[PDB]
Paper text:
Our structural and functional analysis of the chaperonin ɸEL from the bacteriophage EL of P. aeruginosa revealed that the protein is ATPase active and functions in aggregation prevention of denatured proteins. ɸEL forms tetradecameric double ring complexes, which dissociate into a population of single rings in the presence of ATP and at physiological salt concentration. As anticipated, the ɸEL subunits displayed the typical three-domain architecture of chaperonins, composed of an equatorial domain (residues 2–130 and 425–552), an intermediate domain (residues 131–188 and 388–424), and an apical domain (residues 189–387). The domain structures of ɸEL differ from those of GroEL by numerous insertions and deletions, which alter the putative substrate-binding cleft and the contacts at the ring-ring interface. Our functional data rather suggests that the chaperone mechanism of ɸEL is encapsulation independent, and represents an evolutionary precursor of the more complex encapsulation mechanisms used by the group I and II chaperonins.
To obtain the solution structure of apo-ɸEL, we next performed cryo-EM and single particle analysis. Symmetry-free 3D class averaging indicated a tetradecameric double-ring structure with C2 symmetry. Refinement of the particles resulted in a density map at 3.45 Å resolution, which allowed construction of an atomic model. Apo-ɸEL has an open structure with a ring opening diameter at the apical domains of ~65 Å. In the apo-state, ɸEL is a double ring with six of the seven subunits per ring assuming alternating states (conformations II and III) and one subunit in conformation I. The putative SP binding sites in the apical domains of subunits A, C and E are partially occluded. In all subunits of ɸEL the tip of the αA-β2 loop in the equatorial domain is moved away from the nucleotide binding site as in chains B and D of crystal form II. Other nucleotide binding elements such as the P-loop (residues 79–86) and the β17-β18 hairpin (residues 503–512) are also moved outward (~1.5 Å) in the apo structure. These local conformational changes might facilitate ATP-binding. Similar to group II chaperonins and unlike the staggered subunit contacts in group I, the ring-ring interface of apo-ɸEL is formed by two-fold symmetrical contacts between subunits.
Numbering used by the authors:
A (entry chain A), E (entry chain L): 4 to 549
B (entry chain G): 4 to 289, 295 to 549
C (entry chain M): 466 to 549
D (entry chain M): 94 to 186
The structure:
């Protein structure tokens, strides 16, 4: 095949980025246009940034080669969070023009360092919202496409359950009205090591009414095969009297060398097999690190399991250490779900949850916003979380499944709002971050000499201020903010009291006053990921098609 | 593949919408042209708005992509009502030009708001016609393509049965004359799961004079095979004394795994077999509350789970001694005792009371119309007309002409009646403009948004389009270049009967439309117009 | 339709300015006939033509309408062009 | 206006409409002819026209307006020549 | 012919301005390229900005239509000053991109007002150099293309004549060496009204050894025809005894109606005709205005002529008023030249010159830099100026005529240096003017509120700073100023002590230290003319080719 080098590679890269920019940005705003996508023998008509980006194709291979670099990182890899794809593609385009305008490796290392300090300001600026706080309604209202009924219901579900964070699942209903099913059941991060250990021996959903769990810390491979044979046969022979089947071996990771050994150990005692169900199930958890160690401790407390460091510790056990539960558990390939929890068990869980809460009470105010505190809060939420199943209804079939997706967007928004944070919407938080970082470095008289040479005198600082405006511009062009003159310009005073427009009502005020908010994680990741992809496109000189 | 953006996409949209408009509109009026459609190696020549719309194709992928947005929503999805497809495409084109003429998001929120107020007037203007009222003949005469014989017969069928709403089915007859079969019986949506369970073991028409029905909610497959064995054997052993054969297991769906199990369960007890008839029949229905109607008719208990068959008693189990006719297509009830009719009428009143306490907007929704469909099933008579004629082709065409008359009269009594000839939309627009302007409270806001803008005046010109197409090239548009409406014409409208050749009021002459058709045309026309106006991008990949 | 045409000149003069700022397009009412609204482009103020001081010669504006009418009618009613 | 009124004729075709258009536009012309202010020599509104036409000249708009106002009864013909001094010089005859 | 409207017109304008920019700018710098121009059947190879500009042609009419707007104002009209044509095209291209970047009439009225305030700083910054000041050598050295011999000679000619400003003419010599001819003779601004009045009756160079001059103030046309007949015949009849022929009627302007009358008046008295020479010559002067009145007063003092307001004043005259000189005068179509001046006449001229000098002594320091003082100095220089004729020599014919042009450039430079002013070269004066204007407006707390809104917050101020750098960039790219990083950036400290590079030597310093200067009039006019042409090009939307 052909090999493209020099000015032509940069020629293609510029064009493809331009076309994708135009198509995805036209979606945003009050004059938000509509994209008409073909699929098979039907027509899907939407204004969703992610769906547009996923579906853009090119005929030429050179063009398609580049297209997979700009869309696909915020499209195919981004499965957990759908929102913040229109933001990322927008920022990529902007920062690409910044790298082209200030060429050479010396400037590039200066751009990357300034943008990095802007990122540090956004993480500081994040407002950590509480469950009882009414602001969640404004976030719910914006994400629901101005739904009065839905935004009221979902906001109430979190507000009424003050203490426990509800896990919400969605199913296609039958009626015109919606129906809510509340259940006191927990979601766990454990799942099958191998599909063989499930019901039907093919990765099915095994339901249980009794078990005896054991939590191991180590990653298990070929080296621990002998320790498992010594461990399993010790409990099956000696301590069979006080043992409810099946025996759950929860750990960090089970390699295929260890899984094959435990398959044969099930076959060794065929008397304990009941209706096909294997009496021994290995269960993995995706954690890693010594931060990740304490998630297995939560798993241990929920199921009355002992914490074990080594695999060989299975031999030295007793009636005091071994405790077989008689509740109800639902094992799964994705995740396991607990249901029946006795009052004796809930006392142990709540006492352990208070122990984590007491650790958070005795830390500094700065460390409350850190990764340590937020992870410890994620521990609590898993330990005290309830399952809710909403069956969404409507007039037709198509109106139901569309309303299901509209519910899922609201859930994802409110979850991440309480989890990560809240920032002033309307493209205002990025303007405040840039204008903050420049003022801080310039005003600080210690490093003012160096800061002026790198950023201010170069014109990088000034060019970066112009880029933060891009989002605010697209939203509020062709309206009464850009009315007095040709274009609206920010000042020193507007940073203290920002100015936007509520498109639903038709009024001018502050985002804090009117109620326009964004999820913090989406906006932060867009800047990080936009910077990386911009750098790659600007610095590519060669395309190989063979 | 290619990606179209900008002025080009809005260029394609305009061209496709134009070509579809021309082909569908030319059909309407006294100078109604004819369309010649190719299908395989044959030729079908028609002037039916729906059939023309369903069959328009384009070569270019871009052109075809747009074509599936203007026709297909009122073509492929619209299966229940065929009528009002010509009208929807017509209003789409009209309202599209209104959106292009007043661009910008601020005007659009004003257009969408005024049109929504016009819709509220049409829903109020609807005349709720009664069974005995002679106006049904005028609706029947128009829908039958000026048939004097057919419009008389179908109008009499509804008029004579004053108190009960007749369900009418059609079959291809043998004679030249028509033959009517009236029956005082109810039609049910249940049918055989497997042909084996019928009389003769080959999907026949089993007639019964006694049964014991049980209504299950769940869809039944291989997972419920054990629950059926536990359920059936519990009733056959314990509660055999108060049990009239056969036992009818009515449910949502019976899979082949479950049907094979219930075949063997019939063979398990050979003592209860009478003249070949199997004592257990699974019955499927193609909507949770439709099974509740099925339960009330046959004195059957409502059951959520299959395992609930075990925990039953003489209080729950009730074996009927009426008359039922099971079938592969549908089941038919006949003999209903005075004790049973009290239970059905009480349940019917419960559905009626729910409709009494809804808003006026929700009365025209799918919710209310489905609940009315529930009532008519619970209180209805069956009539089977066998249509005849001279040839084979003349019979099947007359069958379709009967079906259009039935659909028209059903929806006439159900939904409503409005003055035809493109008059009800003109009255509604001119009414809503005058109401808002005359109301001195909101007159300040109303004038700024609609009147001074020129939206109000442009909307008046649109309502005229249907009246123009119907009565152009005739004696109404004779005096001057174009006919123009005034204040007086709203009180006493002016049309022309094309059959006779006379000028008068739609009320006087007898030209009417079904209300649900004309309202849905404006609702659906507004939505599709808005999408087309606001599209800037076509993705062909 | 004739009311919409009279607006054309006022549109071209004061588009892209603070008269057409509040909404998509400026619309006249009954009150504006008694006290008209323009914009002095030199100064940058809103008021009445009588107040600010914007005037035209009468014979020019009248003859424009008379001459505009005759030439419009001819162009509208022509169906044939002879090039020989 | 040609462009404007051309569209009006195409929008309402046929000879019967045309004679209505022509008659209404004719009545508009009779209004403009009536609305016209036939300004007198002594009238001070000339200063407002002079101030607009001279690109906001306070000195020139005063002098030329006075030249017309002082000669109430005769319409003055004005000639212009390139002078010599800093100041202007007037020669009335 | 065709009519171009819309986006195509702005498309052509952008392309023609790009090509002219590239062709003319490449001339500048140490890596200054060379242009090879075809003329007839020869080849002219040059790096002269003006000659490149005059010669660029296009094939398409639309392209050539635009080309006559960018070049021809600084090319065909600019006959008095050749220098500052490269600079004018340079700034046009820069200011064009500024007007495109901030569109809309409200922005444009702000740009024009800021650039206007920059112009006022350049006129203030100009250093008024004195005759004895050694800086003239540095100006001469730069303008002569690093000639050590020529720059020494021309600088000495002005320095030795401390008191009188020398007028220099150039002629093609015969020898290898140059030869200087100094003459005590004055140059006057009077010239023939009609070619008929000269020697040979066809606009020749009439040489005289006696005359009687009369200076009239008024512009003469058809109205003064009778006053001339009464005037001329009065002197010829009554005061013939004390009258040396010819009679010179010096005035502001002679129209063709008056010239034809005075032709017939010469024919009326055929006895006074000597060897073809007409005894009456009308003489015009291009002045105008009341500033321009006093130049005729200088003309009156030189030739012992009486000052007359009206033409009819010629009648009322006497022996006290009439004074016929017996010196030597050389009349010409371009200009008249005096030569023989008696000691009695030189006393009258020097006394009148002192009268103008005394007026300048009693004015304020601010008014010394004004138009009034500089014009009054131009009066003195005309009244006390000497004629020098240099005959330039060389080895061949082509080397002589090239050296003639190199002399003329040095003369033009030194004349305008003393006349107008001096500014720090190397594209430094524009950067100092812009950075000065921004700082003055921002620091002034009274108008700081308005100044920030229009210029600073808009990003106009910052974008204008980037333009002033353009000249300095072209000159000192690919050298040791732009060595440490990718690009050199100015700071607050560099305005006090600027940084350039002498390309001849190879050293880093201040323009004041090294010795790089420009003429002030050229740099000011480039900014004025560049702004006007830039505005026109940005605001054009239509091309008519018919």
């Amino acid at each position: 095949t052909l090999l493209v080098h020099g000015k032509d590679a940069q020629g293609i890269i510029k064009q493809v980025l331009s076309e994708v920019y135009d198509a995805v940005t036209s979606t945003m705003g009050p004059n938000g246009q509509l994209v008409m996508i073909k699929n098979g023998v039907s027509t899907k008509t939407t204004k969703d940034g992610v769906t547009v980006a996923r579906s853009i194709r090119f005929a030429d291979e050179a063009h398609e080669l580049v297209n997979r670099v700009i869309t696909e990182p915020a499209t195919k890899t981004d499965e957990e969070c759908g929102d913040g794809t229109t933001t990322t593609i927008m920022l990529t385009h902007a920062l690409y023009h910044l790298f082209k305008d200030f060429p050479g490796f010396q400037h590039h290392r200066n751009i990357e360092d300034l943008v990095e300090r802007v990122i540090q300001r956004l993480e500081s600026m994040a407002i950590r919202v509480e469950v009882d706080d009414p602001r969640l309604y404004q976030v719910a209202l914006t994400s629901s496409n101005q739904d009065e009924k839905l935004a009221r219901l979902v906001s109430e579900l979190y507000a009424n359950n003050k203490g426990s964070y509800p896990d919400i699942e969605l199913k296609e209903g039958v009626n015109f009205e919606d129906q809510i099913e509340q259940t006191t059941g927990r979601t766990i991060r454990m799942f099958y090591a191998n599909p063989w250990f499930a019901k039907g021996h093919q990765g099915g959903v095994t339901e249980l009414t009794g078990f005896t769990a054991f939590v191991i810390d180590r990653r298990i491979d070929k080296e621990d095969t002998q320790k498992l044979i010594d461990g399993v046969n010790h409990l099956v022979k000696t301590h069979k009297q006080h043992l409810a089947l099946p025996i759950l071996l929860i750990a960090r990771s089970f390699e295929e060398a260890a899984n094959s050994t435990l398959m044969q150990l099930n076959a060794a005692h065929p008397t304990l097999v009941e209706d096909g169900r294997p009496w021994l199930i290995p269960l993995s958890t995706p954690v890693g690190g010594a931060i990740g160690t304490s998630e297995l401790q939560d798993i241990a407390v929920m199921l009355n399991a002992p914490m074990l460091s080594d695999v060989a510790d299975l031999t030295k056990l007793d009636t005091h250490s071994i405790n077989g539960q008689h509740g109800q558990l639902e094992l799964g390939g994705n995740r396991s779900i607990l249901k029946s929890t006795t009052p004796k068990d809930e006392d142990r869980i709540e006492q352990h949850a208070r122990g984590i809460e007491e650790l958070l009470e005795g830390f500094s105010l700065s460390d409350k916003f850190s990764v340590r505190a937020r992870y410890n809060e994620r521990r609590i939420r898993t330990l005290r979380g309830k399952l809710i199943t909403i069956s969404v209804g409507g007039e037709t079939y198509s109106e139901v499944k569309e309303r299901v997706d509209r519910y899922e967007d609201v859930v994802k928004a409110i979850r991440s709002a309480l989890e990560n944070g809240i920032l002033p919407g309307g493209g205002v938080s990025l303007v405040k971050a840039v204008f903050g970082t420049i003022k801080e470095g310039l005003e600080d008289k210690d490093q003012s000499a160096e800061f002026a040479k790198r950023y201010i005198n170069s014109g990088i600082a000034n060019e970066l201020m112009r880029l933060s405006t891009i989002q605010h511009k697209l939203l509020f062009k062709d309206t009464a903010l850009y009315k007095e003159n040709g274009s609206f310009h920010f000042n020193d005073d507007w940073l203290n009291t920002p100015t936007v427009m509520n498109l639903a009502t038709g009024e001018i005020g502050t985002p804090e006053g009117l109620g326009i908010y964004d999820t913090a994680y989406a906006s932060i990741t867009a800047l990080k990921g936009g910077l990386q992809t911009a750098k790659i496109l600007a610095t590519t000189k060669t395309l190989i098609l063979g």
